[PDB]
Design an enzyme around this catalytic site. Structure first.
Site, mmCIF file in Angstrom:
data_model
loop_
_atom_site.group_PDB
_atom_site.id
_atom_site.type_symbol
_atom_site.label_atom_id
_atom_site.label_comp_id
_atom_site.label_asym_id
_atom_site.label_seq_id
_atom_site.Cartn_x
_atom_site.Cartn_y
_atom_site.Cartn_z
ATOM 1 N N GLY A 67 29.085 -25.014 8.646
ATOM 2 C CA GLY A 67 28.995 -25.663 7.353
ATOM 3 C C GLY A 67 28.936 -24.703 6.185
ATOM 4 N N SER A 96 30.739 -21.096 13.004
ATOM 5 C CA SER A 96 30.703 -20.198 11.853
ATOM 6 C C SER A 96 29.340 -19.659 11.443
ATOM 7 C CB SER A 96 31.283 -20.931 10.645
ATOM 8 O OG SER A 96 30.304 -21.782 10.083
ATOM 9 N N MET A 97 28.379 -20.547 11.184
ATOM 10 C CA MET A 97 27.062 -20.177 10.691
ATOM 11 C C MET A 97 25.968 -20.325 11.727
ATOM 12 S SD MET A 97 27.720 -19.124 7.656
ATOM 13 C CE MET A 97 26.098 -18.953 6.948
ATOM 14 N N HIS A 121 34.190 -15.984 12.288
ATOM 15 C CA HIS A 121 35.354 -15.859 11.430
ATOM 16 C C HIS A 121 34.889 -15.661 9.999
ATOM 17 C CE1 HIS A 121 35.641 -19.967 9.468
ATOM 18 N NE2 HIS A 121 34.660 -20.134 10.334
ATOM 19 N N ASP A 170 40.120 -16.476 13.890
ATOM 20 C CA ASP A 170 39.204 -17.131 14.815
ATOM 21 C C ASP A 170 39.145 -16.352 16.124
ATOM 22 O OD1 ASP A 170 38.320 -19.948 13.568
ATOM 23 O OD2 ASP A 170 40.424 -19.617 13.076
#
Lengths: 189, 6, 189, 189, 189, 189, 189, 189, 189, 189, 189, 6, 6, 6, 6, 6, 6, 6, 6, 6
Positions: A67, A96-97, A121, A170
């Protein structure tokens, strides 16, 4: 349709939901995309837990497709302010996070299940207007790009010129490759 | 997930 | 519903539309937003006119609310390649790129009517993707910004640090203020 | 479904549409809302007519619910540049800008039918952005407001402080009240 | 899905939500875009808290992407009317109006976390109608523009001609640059 | 899919459409809702016909469900300006404004078929804004209402207080009742 | 997400919402656009409060962007029927009808915060149908226009010919200009 | 995609469409739903044909799913005004109003193919408003209902009380039942 | 967001909503458009109230923009069946059917506030189908029209030929004109 | 927004909704369009009521614009299975199937208010597919048509050939005409 | 984009489209879904061809996915009225009604290509309204069903009880099975 | 469609 | 609605 | 439509 | 398509 | 709204 | 529209 | 907002 | 637009 | 967030 549960301490018959029975055992779940409404609840759970007993372990139990950027740092700083120690576990996915938090746990307490996935990424973005409003956004996003890669280098162990090159794209990873890259410390059996 | 987280 | 006209040279009764009767008198109209379909027609009109008689004047008769960047330079270069001389006239309005062509006429032939308007502003744009696709667009648009302001300085007369400051925004001008700024040479009465 | 007509000068059997048979008698019609596509045709009709015989009268035959501001001045200036004399006639209606042209005819040639209407009002507009982009639009529109009322005062005869007060609103007028206000000179019977 | 909590003072087993357990410790959260419905609740929380014990500190815990102008001043005045002292903390983000409140805290109590962001820019707006309805809106918005910059100058310390120039645009800042600009007093570790 | 026709005067083989073969016999059709585009064509047909032979009868052949108010008067005045005499015939239907033209023919030439219909009603309208913009529209529409009923009284023969009362509503009529009311003079057999 | 509160009179642990804890202290909030559903609740709150203790002050705490006309008078009359005294306070904004109530308070009790805004303008409306249905609406709306301006003249103090002229438009005011115009009596510090 | 045809009278090579080659042989087609645009063309074809040779037969060749009421009578009257004799033929289908014209042919000339269909039903309609606008429409539609059934009784032969009863509904018929009912005179083989 | 209230009879702490605390004092509210769901609740409130104490007054407190016809009579009959006496009060507005109930109260108990409005007009409707389905609807709606005007004549006092003429349209009235027309008996101060 | 009620048998303070306080007095409401979800509730209310006291009267209180066919018979059979007696009352309206139940009450207990309406018409339907799927639906719907008219004949008293003829259409009735037709037995006063 | 062709009889250079060059060789194409607009053109082609030379063969060249029922019989009857002989050829596909025409050719002239398809099925339909409007449609569609199967039995050769059973469904066939069923006579090589 | 329409 | 339903 | 319009 | 249609 | 409704 | 425009 | 509303 | 463009 | 807010 998440069920209810009944619990009996001394008096008995106190009925909880199932997510509030875990928080009584110092567990926090994170099973959604990170927005600003979700982070304000997690930030308020950690501070409540660190007030009754300031020397007792906490867990986080991540499974998320990523997010925002601001909300993740709002949690990365709150985890470092408090006195107790936090431990992190991957369940299914860590995008991602979620992977920036899985590596932010305490050195020696970062677990993962045998069949999991870890992705890293570089940030996305957007810009629009005239030529002077784009030179600003393109200057902000690069500072974020250079801020995260300075944290991952010291958490994992790898040098910086490897993190600048590895992501670029990615890049998926299993639970055994990450144990060598440095994101985690142990696998559960 | 204990032993040891809790 | 644009009418027709009848013309009689020697034989007589040859019927044109009204826009093709002017092109027989070496006139070109530009009354739309500049796209790629409009420019390919203007580029083909200039070359046809410069083949019958290579020493005869041409006119352009601008009225446009601007458009693309590439198509405007596709005309600015074709006007300088050919042998004849081109003259420019403003009618009502001359926006973003029409004003880059109105100043591109021959020194001494750049007219305008008494109640007209002239606008100059810096380019717009857009970008989207990841952090490496934005650093490229933001590097291209600035080179365009620095390319146009190097042409206006030599066409008008003003120094460069004045053109960088004056635009910055939407800046409207009348037909008498432009005669001092340097965009034109005469006013019709 | 506008019909066709047959005409025989010497040879005979030349077939026109009905709008191009009037233009052979030096008549121009204006029966639509003024945009930029309509004005570029009227501007090209006037110049074609003023090339064959530069001393012969022209007519304009207005009936329009108004439109843009720039396109109307693009015609008000072209009517004053050329050598011949133009005369104006109202048919049914003459709204926002049609009334700025009906008064722009030659002194002594401005007619109207007995049951007609004439309307005059101040400009409309629009603006959006941030506080610095609104201070500019609100500065442009007032200069237009003060430019038109300086022309009407000398065309009609009335002082200026009366034109600033009279409009302010939608103000309808018949063909007999306008003969006293000063917009026209005669009524047809 | 925000969890519940159980609390036991003397009798025990009283169940709150997690946002009402903090308000018992004199804490207020602000984690949404400022509208008129959100401000009427914050205004009613402050007055309730300042009635039990009129000499006890309060906190505000900002994280917001801005919003209206009127609602923000409705809070800036209520913070100055009451007797107790208010302290402000940034968490993740502090946009257009959150930064007008973060600087409105008590001198000596304005904190921030190490990795945060602070943005300041001039108001937006909109207008539509006729020439007399735009001259009014463009006169109101400038008075607001000149009202806020007179407060920031005395809160921070900087002169006024620097605030008029610095904003003009979107201007992002970290937690260390703001400590020099004057928006805050300390950073947490 | 309206067919074509072949005609042979002296040379022969000249091909018309079917609507332009009638206009060669001094006939005009009106078979649509009256707008501003339709009226500008009828106004141009009448003037063309009244230029070749200024003493020859014309016909109009109405069948329409009404339309605008301005465009109808634009035709009612042009019919009275010219020298020749116009005659009117109803075919099927004659609604709001078609009936204002059917009665506007020459005294003694106003025909109708045995099974036809004639309707007369007062104008419609619309208004919106603030209290000062409604007092104006409601003052204009009543002047139109009082203008048409002053023409019908002299064309038909009836007094005025009967026309104010009779309409008030939708009032349908046949071809025999209208011969007594005064709208027409004869019925075809 | 408006929080809950706990209150202990003699028995203790009675839990309210935050808007019902103020109504126990004789306070009413008005923080929405005035419709018919909102007014029926305010009308029922005032009557309930004026039944327990008929000699005790009440407050109203306005912040609204206006609304209907009928619902506002439904409150203006109920405030004058009852025995107790009502006092009014502006918070942020007081638009079309909120300003008709802010001035309707008791002489000597009409407060406002230092940075507030007050707007007054004439009614809006709408009408559609035929010429007889518009003459009625345009006759009703003017009676309302003349009814409100007869109340404001006696509440404020100004003559009537000044109120007819001042509004005419959107007219914004601060908290210090209104203290001279007469809408309020004091400013809070 | 309707083809073209070539025809050679004396000179040769004159190219028609296929629908205009039949009209040269005194044939009219009607193959669409009856509206007001279709009827104005048929009315103009009949009058053109009855001007060259006023003593020569005409045909009509019906195939239509009905339509309006006014347009059908506009043709029923024009067929009776002219001097020549008209004959009617059904092809596939003859719905609501096509059957009112098929019976309107000349006594002794009304043909039909062996496998065809003929339908007759009472009118449809619609109404809306208030109680006084419905009493009018419901009074008009019944007069039409009683007008058509007075024509069919004399064309066919049947009494009137049978036509009022027979329709009432959708009533389909073949080509042999209609020969007894009275709508036609012969069947083609 | 309608608040709650606390009430203490003997035991104390029983919490109602605000609309159910009035019904304990024999009050009924009607603040919506009349449909079939609203009327079934009012019909059930009246019967419940008339069972505890069959000799005690009831109130109705109208404010409505009208609605259906059947539901209004379903209440007009229930008010006349029961034994107790009902009284009616206007608050703000009383449209189409609210005014049929305001006059249906007991003779001597029909109040109204000084600044109110009262409207009366004839029914609306709709119909569609074929000629036999319209003659039925147009016969039903007129019987309703003649049923209501026979009740108003005896409630107010006026003759019938005045009620047939007065309505015909939208007819607005104040609280002082209605006191003479006969709809009410007193005004509150 | 349907209110609540408080009831005190011996212990006191038991709070119901208003629709469940009537069911304690053996009353059932039916105020919606009949579907399958509504009928399953009514069928379950009747059986619950007929289990406590099998000899006690029940009421039904109809007001409905009709609905399905199956669900209505599902209630008509359940009313005849049980031992107690059911009575029916019309309130405002009784459409397609409500009138099949109003007549299904016990002989001697079928009431109605003075100003009510009763409608009876034959079923609607729909079909689509190929020629063999339509012959089936058209065979089912006629058996339903012949099933209902065999019940109404014995409930009312009229012969069958009168019911086949009377309906055929929408047929409205008042409360006095139905007392003669046979649908009801008494009128309330 | 269908090309053009040039043809030279004696004079030369006459340019046709490609579909009108075949019609000069007595060929008709049918390559679309059968509607009412397509059939009126085919019916007019056959009659034109049968007027020049009444003893010369014609072809039809079918490829269609079916369509209406009426339009197909409109062609089946016209093929039998005229004097010449028609021959039919399948190209790719011959669906619902194309197969009713392919079998309608002259005995001995019904060809088909080796890889083709032939489908036959019973009609589709639709109905809606009340119980009396469905009994009519379901009575019409069955007569059509029994009309087509009486033609196919005599064209092919098979008995009738086999055609009623075989179709019932979609039944596809090749070019060799149809030669035995009886739909065609020969296959091309 | 002749004989006899035309 | 009593007397007599209830 | 003659006699007499034309 | 000849021989023999045409 | 008393005196006198209630 | 002559006399006199044309 | 007291002193003095309440 | 001559004199002098053309 | 204490020491010192609370």
């Amino acid at each position: 349709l998440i069920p209810t549960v009944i619990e009996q301490t001394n008096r008995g018959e106190r009925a909880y939901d199932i997510y509030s029975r875990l928080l009584k055992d110092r567990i926090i779940m994170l099973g959604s995309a990170i927005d600003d409404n979700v982070a304000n609840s997690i930030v308020s759970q950690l501070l409540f837990l660190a007030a009754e007993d300031p020397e007792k372990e906490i867990s986080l139990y991540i499974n998320s497709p990523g997010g925002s950027i601001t909300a993740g740092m709002a949690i990365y700083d709150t985890m470092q302010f408090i006195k107790p120690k936090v431990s992190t576990i991957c369940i299914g996915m860590a995008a991602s996070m979620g992977a920036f938090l899985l590596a932010a746990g305490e050195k020696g307490k970062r677990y993962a299940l045998p069949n999991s996935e870890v992705m890293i990424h570089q940030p996305l973005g957007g810009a629009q207007g005239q030529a002077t409003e784009i030179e600003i956004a393109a200057k902000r996003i690069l500072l974020l790009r250079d801020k995260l890669n300075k944290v991952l280098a010291e958490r994992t162990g790898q040098p910086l010129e490897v993190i600048e090159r590895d992501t670029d794209r990615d890049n998926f990873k299993s639970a055994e490759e990450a144990l060598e890259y440095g994101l985690i410390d142990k696998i559960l059996t | 997930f204990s032993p040891a987280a809790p």
